[PDB]
Amino acid sequence: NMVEPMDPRTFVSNFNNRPILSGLDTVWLCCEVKTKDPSGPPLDAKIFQGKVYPKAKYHPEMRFLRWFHKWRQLHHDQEYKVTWYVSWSPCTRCANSVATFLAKDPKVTLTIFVARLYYYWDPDYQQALRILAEAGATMKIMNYNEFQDCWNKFVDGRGKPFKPWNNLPSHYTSLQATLGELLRHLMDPGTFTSNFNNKPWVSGQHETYLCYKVERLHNDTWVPLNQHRGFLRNQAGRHAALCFLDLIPFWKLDGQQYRVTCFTSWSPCFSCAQEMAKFISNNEHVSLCIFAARIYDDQGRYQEGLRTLHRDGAKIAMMNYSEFEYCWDTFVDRQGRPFQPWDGLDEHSQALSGRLRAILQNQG
Amino acid sequence: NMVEPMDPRTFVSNFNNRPILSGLDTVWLCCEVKTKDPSGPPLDAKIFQGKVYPKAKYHPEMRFLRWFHKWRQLHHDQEYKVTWYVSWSPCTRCANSVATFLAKDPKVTLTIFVARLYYYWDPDYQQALRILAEAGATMKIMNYNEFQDCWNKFVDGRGKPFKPWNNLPSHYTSLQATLGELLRHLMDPGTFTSNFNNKPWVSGQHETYLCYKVERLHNDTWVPLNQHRGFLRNQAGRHAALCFLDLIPFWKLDGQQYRVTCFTSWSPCFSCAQEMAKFISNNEHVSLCIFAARIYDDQGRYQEGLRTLHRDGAKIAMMNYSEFEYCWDTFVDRQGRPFQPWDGLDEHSQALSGRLRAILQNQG
Ligand SMILES: [Zn+2]
Ligand SMILES: [Zn+2]
Ligand SMILES: [Zn+2]
Ligand SMILES: [Zn+2]
């Protein structure tokens, strides 16, 4: 079995799913590496533990990555299926290191079972889970069978079986509903209504939401690629347009002709416009179309940015009624409700279209 | 009277307060300069017009600043009361230029009557109005009397009297309530509840709100200065802690000893911590007290920043129930309702206190 199994009290203290209020100290990761055949024996199994504070370098997911890099050198270059049972959901830094690892090595596939979710006072925690999902990691809450499997495979049970605790199924249900909500797919209607708006009073909105879709040129028709379809938002300290650029390479598009469409609630500031100019200049097989609900004055060179983005290709347009309705129909968890326009939508669209046409062309 | 009066049709289309949906073109500013004596005759009166797009250098508030700078060199060095009737509220750039002019020149006081509010798709429009108010500008909605006075003093009416339009009062009332809301002074309760919270799930909250109060040391008792008391929030492209430092010189504090207290919904990132350390090093008569609702991990050197701030003086502490309740009582438009704690408030306070005590100190 295992070289040094987990102590039953450690398991009971850490692999549990009832809500608690204490801060984190140590997190545990039970890890199993298998071949491509699910009924093959496990190639290896190891337990990792790490202190949450004060450095993420020592979190068990980082220890796993460093371990796995040396461990894989000692076998043939083959496909691996890795499974983690982890007592708490990973931190943002580790979510990003794992997503990058998965993206750079397609021969590894990862399934992550978490006992409980932790959020780390991170305003961008949701986007960390979403980046893991985009890099191919499967993430589920541990249910009865997984707790019992981790008990059998990793705990020094001394013949004793997994004894469940009271309300285990109920905590599972609540956590899994929470996880599914964090991994949505379709945007919340209140989110759409708070952000995709063009009234000149913007209700103090500093967030930028971005709905994206990709089409491929195939026998001279544009065919949708619905597996690359969704929405994102800005991060604390990283603008939404930059996160969109960071998302694109996870799609691993080939050299065919692609058309990427973004509906963004704010047009790009100058710096994000310049990064988008660089991206489209280095990826000319990719046609970029940006529709903005509002024009963002970054108190600087945003007009130069919009003109530079327009000149390097890229269609830039203000959203009209039709684009708003399309975004609602296509990206919103609307449950059959129709689009509901707000007063002045068409007039503000017309005024903003004029301002944009004036920015392009010239006068400033 | 005046050398160039406004044409009645110009007044009718621009000095009106009914809601409209069109974009802005030209804005009008009727200006009257008087001495400190209300019963003195007006020394001068001038009309300015400016195109809103594409450069704020030509907005009428800027033309007024350039004109007035030359005008006052040619008149007596005395105190002046300036009155503006302006067809729309100023843009951010003009609001800040006027605030700076007012702050650097105490012998001039400005009253601004606006026919209608315009928001320019600016997420920080509220702060522009608020910085105008903190520099001493009085800002009111034009009522019947102000429309009538503007008509008499500035319009080529050819003996005709001011004729009001239908719903002048009702639009006035709606507009003045909106303006009063923009200059609040006391924080809306929903704002407080959405931002001053310490659950480790932060609801993606990227805003930082900051409540401040000032004390004076007088014969070794700490006296409040309730004229320097309020709240602010971050801007697009400028963090809340920087906005607070920018605010402090508007207070024109002398060389006595002052204690400034911040209750912030996020502890400062590294760059803001360093700017605050610079501030307290250049203003040793000002003792700084920071209470944070949550610790903000800026994905960089934020722990060094908190340590530097703590080493340079400056008390850094996490908010407990007592501080939350004090902020509710002191800064919130609570209308007599008591503070309502949320679940886990005390436990999350204790966990964050532990983390902060570990960050100060050391361990990594
Ligand atoms: Zn981590
Ligand atoms: Zn940007
Ligand atoms: Zn202006
Ligand atoms: Zn900061």
Author numbering:
A (entry chain B), B (entry chain A): 7 to 142, 147 to 246, 255 to 382
Paper's wording?
APOBEC3s (A3s) are an APOBEC subfamily in mammals that restrict viruses, including retroviruses, endogenous retroelements, Hepatitis B virus, and Epstein-Barr virus. The double-domain A3G, A3F, A3D, and single-domain A3H (haplotypes II, V, and VII) are active in restricting HIV-1 through deaminase-dependent and independent modes, with A3G being most potent among them. In order to understand the structural basis of domain organization and molecular regulation of the complex biological functions of A3G, we determined the double-domain structure of rA3G.
Two fl rA3G mutational constructs (termed FKL and E/Q) yielded well-behaved proteins and crystals in different conditions that diffracted to 2.47 and 2.40 Å, respectively. Additional changes in these two constructs improved the solubility and yield of rA3G including replacement of an 8-residue CD1 loop 8 by the 4-residue loop 8 from hA3G-CD2 (as in both E/Q and FLK constructs), further mutations F126Y on CD1 loop 7, K180S/L184S on CD1 h6, and 8-residue deletion of the CD2 loop 3 (as in the FKL construct). The constructs also contain catalytic E259 to Q/A mutation to avoid potential toxicity during recombinant protein expression. While the FKL structure shows a canonical fold of its CD2 domain, the E/Q structure shows significant alteration in CD2 conformation, with major changes on helix 2 (h2), loop 3, loop 4, and the Zn-active center.
